Paper text:
The V/A-ATPase from a thermophilic bacterium, Thermus thermophilus (Tth V/A-ATPase) is a rotary ATPase that has been well characterized using both structure and single molecular observation studies. The Tth Vo moiety, responsible for proton translocation across the membrane, contains a central rotor complex (d1c12) and stator apparatus made up of the a subunit and two EG peripheral stalks (a1E2G2). In the holo Tth V/A-ATPase, pmf drives rotation of the d1c12 rotor complex relative to the surrounding stator, resulting in rotation of the entire central rotor complex (D1F1d1c12) and inducing sequential conformation changes in the A3B3 catalytic hexamer to produce three ATP molecules from ADP and inorganic phosphates per one rotation.
The Vo structure reveals that the asol region and d subunit adopt distinct conformation, appropriate for inhibiting rotation of d1c12 relative to the stator a subunit. This conformation is different from that seen in the Vo moiety of the complete Tth V/A-ATPase. The final map shows clear density for protein components of Vo, including subunit a, subunit d and the c12 ring, but the EM density for both EG stalks, which attach to the asol region, is weak indicating disorder or flexibility in these regions. In contrast to the Vo structure in the holo complex, the asol region in the isolated Vo is located in close proximity to the d subunit as a result of kinking and twisting of the coiled coil at residues a/L119 and a/A246 (indicated by the arrows). The isolated Vo domain displays no proton conductance when the membrane potential is lower than 120 mV, defining a voltage threshold.
Author numbering:
A (entry chain L): 2 to 21
B (entry chain M): 3 to 323
C (entry chain N): 4 to 652
D (entry chain Z), F (entry chain O), K (entry chain T), L (entry chain U), M (entry chain Y), N (entry chain X): 8 to 80
E (entry chain K): 21 to 42
G (entry chain P): 5 to 80
H (entry chain Q), I (entry chain R), J (entry chain S), P (entry chain W): 7 to 80
O (entry chain V): 9 to 80
């Protein structure tokens, strides 16, 4: 849902941290 | 309910009111003996210092203990009238608070009035950062004015207009509830009140950001669209043009502060007119109005004593003719 | 009554002796100085000392207030003025800091209570811990207009990068935006475009983690009253441990300030002095000896009594023999009568307890009223104050003594009227072989049977109305006597007109029900109404015509003296009847049960209606009687005389 | 006959009762405003009692008519 | 409050996995 | 007499009692405003007693009627 | 079993009902009237005239009630 | 006998005029309250206050009318 | 015999007209009170004040109608 | 037999119509009070105030209905 | 013997009139609050008319009993 | 006889009528409050209906008694 | 006869009942303002009882009449 | 001889009824202010409860009259 | 017998007056409750309770009504 | 008239309990208003409000006492 979409848009930052 | 009960408590608290001799007595006095004088009265009970900050903290604490209870003391139908009667000057307190946060004057200076919110809540409101924060902190104790301030903030975001628009919407809601109640003296008082608010907001604009009818509000009795639109310009002699109604008593044009003084005086007088109806609302009306005038006089006299300001300028203020 | 207070307007010479004269008088006796021909107050040092003394006095009052205790005169404080101020300011400032702490903590607990529940709900919905770089800002919007406004604002801000936490609460909703790493900057702008910012906290925790800060606020609220209660009892100990010096200083300061404010009027006149004074004759020798012995001032000057010149400036203090003094309570609070005009302190004892007797019965309640009298007399024997939560009753022994004498009068007249009524119908129905009983065919008490409403009715109510006639006539005649003394033609003619019209309508009733003797009555009624009309004419106030009806109402109003009595008496009678009835329905166990329940119902009806009983005859004296001869019209200057308070040592 | 006396009784009871109700409706407002004024100023006690028992005359005269009928049997 | 419940449940595991992995 | 006297009693009772009730309902508000006046301005006691006493004429007239009925008894 | 029994007695009850109910009316009226007046006059005796006029005017109700009563007594 | 008739019509007239006077009374009460109020400040309109106080008089007028009809039949 | 035929009808007449008078009394009462209030607040409302004051007389009129009908019953 | 009959019938008639009038009186009282208030606020409430005020008239209409309904029994 | 029809009609009148003022007081307070709401905002008209016409069922029940009684005749 | 036949109607009509008066004053206050809340916000129309329909039980019991009597007639 | 003893009961009952109602009405507002002043200031409990126990005399007059009538039995 | 029992019954019924009505009229305002006071204070319990229980004197008198009426039945 | 009519008047007075009592009670009680609801929903829980307490009145009315009706 | 005797006894008992319940209702009106207000201020004072709500029930208890005293006769 919209909550999961916002959670993915936020976890994009965690993915970027893990890629860093 | 049972106005007779609220009226009994009001008539008890009216006995500890400060007689008229006290004002002229403390008019010419030193701050130590002034503090003494305040120690003898009822306000002594919460006076815990010798400096002006503690004096005014005591004054506000006692006005709150002694007036800000009247809602909570009654329920049902009379609670509505008394909640109106306090919410008016609660609006006015928030209005002055907004104007203060505009000019950055410290919260300790902004004059507060006896309202249903305690002292510390307004302390927070000014200690809050931006007007939206004020709305939120006012919504914390569930204030029927918080949501109004919020809904008006989302439109203007300018303190010159938002205060008067807030007044308009609040008077709409609360004059609605009042007309629902249908009490004679209360309705006449609401009339005088909305009229006074109009005559002040007229003086507060003076040509800038003009809106000769977007800032008006219905429900009045003695001022009207035409005289309001006049005072929407820079004219000043529009007052004695209104010669019949009590607002002819102002009979002058000095300054926004002196205009507000005259309006406070005439409204206090017309409330004093409402004593001769014990089993009703006129009594508690007159008592709350006299109590807020008492607080304002204590302010304008502790100010003068502490700063040693000359006796003349405040003597001009004490009489309320 | 007035005991004819008389002007003692002396005239000392030495201005430097005035402080001496007043330091004498205040410890000596009572004079109640007026403000006659006043002049200045010797400004340089006298104004200063007055200021400091009133300051320390009201300071004592203020710190007594904050300490909880009330003002009380205990003992002077002779240690000095500088020492007085330097022994007050420490204790007053200590207690002032104390109450500062207490009220600050009250405010703190208030704020914590106000902030708790919304913050608690937020924390409950603060599943996402507020440590993370992507943030959780806290709004507090309402319910109805909440959703669309903030939703559109956040959509204009970003595209569903935000997350909302909606939960119902006492407020509208506990709205909560979940914000990304750097989105908070623009999200504040977006919500301000919607009209909301983040809900800032009291400030000492507006920056901590909200979850932790929630527990912090909870803990403060859970500990604040404990801290508040401990600082309260701390203040209480501070109060108790020094209150002696407080009241002592207060006494000394009140003496000094009364002395100085008196001097302010005293340093007057066109010569080196001027003074007037009011002392009762029954104290004049005492004030004279007190002036002569210590002072023997340059000279004094005594004046006459000037029965009426202004009639206001003269004070009054009701005196009376202890044959009737305790009753002074029962007339004091209504008014203080002006000098000259009559004083009704002596009339109350003649009637009030007698009427009360006429209301209740001896075996009925005189026994238990004397038990209460014994209780209160022991209470005054130990000389203790009365402390009862029913109100701020501080019944000092000088009040309990008066009360026990009053109750003694009341109970004696009740003893009298009891056997005249033969009360406790029960005890009479049970056994009184001395006089005709209900169990007897011929039921007759000693004189009259109030339990028999058929035979004794008209007699008893005629007796009550006779009390009315005699008392009201005394009232009107006294009004006329005072109109003669005070030389007010209106007063006199109005009084005699009410008297005449009232006796006229009385004889009218007599004829209308009792008899017919023309010259005895018809002529009497005619001439009564004629003198009434003569009065309304040569008085021209003409409010008689409205009030004359009220005056007949008043004279009749004494029917209640019998009415309340009949009600209560035969109530007790029928209750005793029910008691013996239940005793007869069953055996001796039934007898015990019935006596118990009858006693219980009697105690209930007693503690209920006894106040109305005590209150009727006294209100007959209060409004039926006093209103006529004039007792609420003027009010003489009450006796507030110059004196060291010292509880009148 | 008995009907006579019975109607006498009901009429006189009605008289005293209605007059009592009149004094009641009066004293309600009266004593309310009274105790009010008293609580602020213990001196206001006098006129408070004057006015609380000025309309006692109504039930007094109702009771007078009651007594007239009573004596009339 | 279904939106709030779902959002809290999601973000919980989201931040958990974030702090765990990186 | 007969039933006539009987009922006549109820006539008198209605007259006097309802008159007293009229006075009482008029004594309530008038006297309360009077207590309100006297509680703040001593000098209005006189001009308040007149207002508090005037509506007593209602029970005066009701009493006139209650008596005239007694005449026809 | 008197002839004019029910006759005279109901004339009585009618007289009493008339006067008493008219009294109730006058009382209810003068209640509000004086409740406004007594307050009014405490501002200026130049308001006492009209205040007393308004107080006395509704007494015409009891005037009419007593007139009806007199008519009934005449029929008796 | 005719006593029942001649008396019941009497109590009818009484009740009629009485309840009519009661109606007029309550109406005059409410009306004259604001009447006195609006005269109090300047007595600018005695006319409208008096007129509104007088309008409800029709009630007791009609009560008297019914009573007159009945007594005429008496 | 014609005992109370003519009489109870009269009691009905009186009761009807009187209770109708009460209805109009209460209605006209509150109405006129607020109406005098408005008139004091502004003179321009004499019309509407009169309209609302005079609408509720239908009640006493219908009471009079029932009364006259019962009179017709004689 | 018929006298008391008709008499009572009239009593029922009067009581019905009268307390119907009373209901309409109370209703119209409060309603028209709030009405004339709103009218003083502006004209635009004239229609709603009137349609509110004239609405409870159904009460006295039902009263006159039941009156006429029992009228045939005379 | 017209006692039957008589008392039946008077019971009918009593029921219908009592129910009349029963719905009357309800519509009174309700219409006060309603017309207030309408003067506030025009868009509550039907929401008000519902509550104004909801108590009608009371006088409906009154007339129901009236019809049930007259039918007995 | 016929008198008791009609008095049954008197009683049942009085029962329904006073029940109607009771529920009428109840609905008066309830509908006042409910219209207030509704005009404030629409979110309480349902609870307004519930509270306003609750006092109908009074007139329902009234009609119940009325029918209990109608069985006797 | 019989109706003598019959209607004497309605007489006394109406008397005591109406007088008690009068005292209740007079006592309601008085005691209300009484407990008001009390809770606001404990000091004047005495005034509250004084003004509370004065209007209880009307029911006393009522009992006087009721008992005088009971004397006739 | 028999009807008298019924009139005595209606007498005592009316007596207790009206007396309890008056007592309730008092209780209404008294306890309303009582709850208003006990709302924020807990010490006012002992005084508001006295003021509530005191007006029961009226219904006690009603019970008195009723029982003494029964005494002959 | 003939009493049945007066028995009906009795029960009618009983149920109807008790009904008027509950009417006034529920009137004030709900007029306060409904207003209270506009601030929270626990007001619903308590206000229903306090609306049903006056039901005791009409319940006692019907009680006495059936009691006497057994005699009818 | 033993029939009419029992009938008046029923009128008595019913009127008694009815008026007693009326009094308890009138009292319980204000009591409930105040209690609901108090509860709306705090969920703790219910323990006293309810104590007052059920305090004037003694009036109906007395009404029922007298109703039963009259019952036992029927």
């Amino acid at each position: 849902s919209k909550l999961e979409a916002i959670l993915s848009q936020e976890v994009e930052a965690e993915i970027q941290a893990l890629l860093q | 309910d049972d106005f007779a009960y609220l009226n009994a408590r009001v008539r008890v608290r009216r006995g500890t009111l400060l007689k008229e001799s006290f004002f002229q007595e403390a008019l010419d006095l030193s701050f130590a003996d002034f503090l003494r004088l305040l120690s003898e009265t009822v306000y002594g009970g919460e006076l815990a210092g010798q400096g002006l900050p503690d004096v005014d903290r005591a004054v506000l604490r006692t006005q709150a203990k002694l007036v800000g209870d009247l809602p909570r003391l009654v329920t049902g139908e009379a609670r509505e009238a008394v909640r109106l009667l306090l919410l008016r000057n609660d609006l006015h307190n928030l209005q002055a608070l907004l104007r203060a946060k505009a000019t950055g004057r410290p919260f300790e200076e902004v004059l507060l009035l006896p309202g249903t919110l305690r002292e510390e809540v307004w302390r927070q409101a000014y200690e809050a950062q931006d007007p939206a924060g004020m709305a939120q902190v006012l919504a914390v104790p569930g204030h029927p004015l918080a949501r109004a301030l919020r809904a008006v903030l989302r439109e203007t975001q300018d303190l010159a207009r938002v205060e008067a628009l807030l007044a308009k919407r609040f008077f709409e809601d609360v004059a609605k509830a009042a007309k629902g109640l249908d009490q004679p003296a209360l309705r006449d008082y609401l009339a005088l009140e909305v009229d006074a608010e109009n005559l002040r907001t007229a003086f507060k604009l003076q040509g800038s950001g003009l809106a000769p009818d977007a800032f008006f509000l219905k429900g009045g009795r003695f001022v009207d669209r035409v005289r309001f639109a006049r005072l929407m310009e820079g004219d000043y002699a529009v007052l004695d043009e209104l010669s019949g109604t009590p607002f002819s008593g102002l009979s002058g044009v000095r300054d926004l502060k002196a205009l507000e003084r005259g309006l406070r005086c005439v409204l206090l007088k017309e409330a004093k007119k409402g004593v001769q109806d014990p089993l009703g609302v006129g009594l508690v009306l007159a008592y709350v109005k006299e109590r807020e005038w008492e607080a304002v006089r204590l302010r304008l006299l502790a100010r003068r004593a502490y700063f040693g300001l000359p006796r003349a300028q405040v003597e001009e203020e004490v009489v309320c003719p | 009554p007035m005991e004819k207070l008389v002007l003692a307007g002396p005239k000392g010479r030495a201005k430097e002796l005035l402080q001496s004269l007043q330091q004498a008088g205040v410890v000596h006796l009572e004079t109640l100085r007026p403000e006659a021909l006043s002049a200045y107050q010797l400004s340089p040092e006298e104004r200063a000392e007055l200021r400091r003394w009133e300051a320390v006095s009201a300071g004592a009052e203020h710190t007594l207030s904050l300490l909880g205790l009330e003002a009380e005169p205990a003992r002077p404080f002779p240690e000095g003025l500088e020492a007085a101020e330097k022994a007050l300011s420490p204790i007053q400032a200590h207690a002032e800091g104390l109450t500062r702490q207490k009220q600050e903590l009250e405010e703190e607990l208030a704020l914590a209570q106000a902030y708790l529940e919304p913050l608690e709900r937020l924390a409950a919905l603060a599943h996402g811990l507020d440590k993370s770089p992507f943030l959780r800002v806290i709004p507090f919007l309402l319910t109805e207009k909440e959703l669309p406004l903030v939703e559109e604002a956040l959509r204009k801000a970003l595209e569903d990068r935000y997350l909302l936490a909606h939960e119902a609460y006492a407020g509208g909703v506990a709205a909560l935006v979940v914000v990304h790493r750097k989105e908070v900057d623009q999200a504040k702008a977006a919500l301000s475009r919607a009209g909301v910012a983040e809900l800032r906290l009291p400030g000492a925790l507006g920056e901590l983690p909200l979850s932790e800060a929630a527990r912090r606020l909870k803990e403060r609220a859970e500990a604040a009253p404990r801290e508040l209660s401990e600082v309260r009892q701390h203040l209480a100990k501070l109060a108790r441990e020094s209150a002696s010096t407080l009241q002592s200083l207060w006494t000394r300061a009140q003496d000094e300030v009364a002395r100085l404010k008196a001097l302010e009027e005293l340093a007057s006149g066109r010569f080196g002095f001027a003074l007037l004074g009011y002392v009762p004759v029954k104290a004049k020798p005492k004030v004279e000896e007190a002036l002569a012995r210590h002072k023997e001032s340059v000279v004094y000057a005594f004046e006459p009594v000037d029965e009426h010149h202004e009639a206001d400036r003269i004070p009054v203090v009701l005196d009376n023999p202890p044959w009737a003094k305790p009753f002074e309570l029962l007339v004091s609070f209504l008014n203080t009568p002006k000098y000259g005009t009559f004083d009704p302190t002596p009339v109350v004892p003649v009637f009030f307890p007698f009427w009360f007797g006429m209301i209740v019965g001896d075996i009925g309640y005189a026994l238990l009223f004397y038990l209460v009298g014994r209780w209160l007399s022991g209470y005054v024997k130990r000389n203790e104050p009365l402390v009862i939560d029913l109100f701020a009753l501080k019944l000092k022994p000088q009040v309990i003594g008066k009360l026990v004498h009053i109750l003694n009068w009341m109970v004696f007249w009740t003893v009298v009227w009891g056997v005249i009524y033969g009360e406790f119908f029960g005890t009479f129905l049970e056994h009184l072989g001395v006089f005709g009983t209900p169990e007897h065919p011929g039921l007759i008490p000693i004189l009259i049977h109030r339990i028999d409403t058929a035979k004794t009715a008209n007699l008893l109510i005629l007796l009550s109305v006779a009390f009315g006639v005699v008392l009201v006539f005394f009232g009107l005649a006294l009004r006329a006597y005072l109109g003669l003394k005070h030389r007010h033609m209106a007063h006199f003619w109005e009084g005699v007109g009410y008297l005449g019209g009232l006796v006229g309508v009385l004889a009218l009733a007599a004829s209308y029900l009792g008899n017919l003797q023309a010259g005895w009555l018809q002529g009497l009624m005619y001439l009564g109404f004629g003198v009434f009309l003569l009065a309304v004419l040569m008085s021209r106030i003409w409010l008689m015509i409205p009030e004359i009806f009220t005056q007949a109402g008043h004279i009749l109003s004494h029917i209640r003296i019998y009415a309340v009595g009949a009600a209560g008496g035969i109530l007790a009678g029928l209750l005793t009847d029910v008691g013996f009835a239940l005793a007869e329905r069953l055996g001796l166990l039934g007898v015990l049960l019935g006596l118990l329940v009858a006693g219980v119902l009697h105690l209930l009806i007693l503690l209920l209606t006894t106040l109305g009983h005590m209150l009727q005859p006294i209100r007959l004296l209060w409004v039926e009687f006093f209103t006529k001869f004039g007792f609420y019209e003027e009010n003489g200057r009450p006796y507030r005389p110059f004196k060291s308070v010292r509880e009148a040592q | 006959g008995g009907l006579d006396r019975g109607l006498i009784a009901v009429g006189m009871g009605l008289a005293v009762g209605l007059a009592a109700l009149g004094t009641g409706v009066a004293q309600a407002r009266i004593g309310a405003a009274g105790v009010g004024a008293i609580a602020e100023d213990r001196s206001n006690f006098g006129t408070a009692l004057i006015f609380l028992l000025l309309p006692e005359t109504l039930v007094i005269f109702g009771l007078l008519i009651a007594f007239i009928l009573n004596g009339r049997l | 409050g279904l939106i709030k419940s779902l959002a809290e449940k999601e973000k919980q595991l989201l931040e958990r996995l974030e702090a765990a992995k990186k």
